[PDB]
């Protein structure tokens with residue numbers, strides 16, 4: 001037989017996983033769907049090739065430990081991990097996850113969402129985020145392609161590769177210098193569900209700022225009273241005045257409760273931005289909000305080691321150890 005190959009990438013995941021097809025990619029790897037001949041369903045297999053770069057090694061170890069600890073309906077998990085039987089041979093890691101049918105990015109390219117569906121998707125994003133944040137974890141890269149959907153509108157957040165204890169979805173703080181950065185991203189996603197287009201599609205860093213200011217209007221002095229990059233501050237002060245554009249002009253036929261929540265998520269000042277529990281409790285989400293049925297994590301997630309300080313080789317060792325429990329005869 002042999003090991004299978006997909007678009008230039010070896011996928012050494014047989015014999016349990018076969019019939020592979022491309023379904024996505026990342027900076028240092030690729031995702032395929034595959035047939036699992038044990039559970040008799042198709043799965044997703046995420047191949048990661050990180051070991052040349054320390055940063056990639058850090059993220060890979062964070063992603064694995066986070067996801068193996070988390071357990072939540074609106075969060076992608078890990079069912080299996082494949083890697084070589086010896087550390088000298090381990091060049092790749094294969095993370096096996098539940099297969100989802102599509103993502104919100106694709107959905108928004110092809111479909112108009114009803115207000116009820118927007119409401120329901122927003123609720124599930126926030127319910128999952130509430131769990132994440134309750135563990136004192138930040139996702140940091142929420143965007144429509146990281147929101148997976150199955151046939152029945154169940155939603156799951158994926159790609160925890162940037163999790164810690166994308167320009168269009170990037171909060172102003174990030175560019176002008178916390179859980180509030182995920183809230184900003186969710187705001188951008190809500191706006192995108194409302195109009196089927198990204199609200200702040202900047203082509204570069206400066207242009208991103210101009211797009212935000214183009215809607216929010218010139219920042220107040222309180223908005224600028226904070227630690228801020230000098231270049232950014234000087235740049236913003238060099239700009240002419242910008243008027244605030246009212247949400248109901250940008251989104252003429254949107255539910256007014258949806259816009260009220262949007263306004264609170266897309267607040268320039270992170271300290272004034274709505275937090276996830278308040279967002280779930282907002283009137284827009286009344287029909288789904290159910291604090292009886294919104295799990296939080298038992299304890300805040302913490303790492304025992306300073307991953308930032310460790311050399312690649314030590315991290316690779318840790319990855320080898322973390323993944324050992326999935327090896328046969330363990």
Ligand SMILES: O=C1c2cc(-c3ccnc(NC4CCOCC4)n3)cn2CCCN1[C@H](CO)c1cccc(Cl)c1
Pocket residue numbers: 023024025026027028029030031044046047048097098099100101102103145146148158159160161
């Ligand atoms: O982590 C995922 C991922 C995994 C999945 C996933 C998981 C389960 N099912 C389905 N179904 C598909 C069916 C067709 O339509 C789209 C959804 N997708 C999606 N993503 C999002 C994009 C790919 N990356 C990340 C980058 O962000 C990544 C991957 C590999 C290496 C590296 Cl370095 C990073």
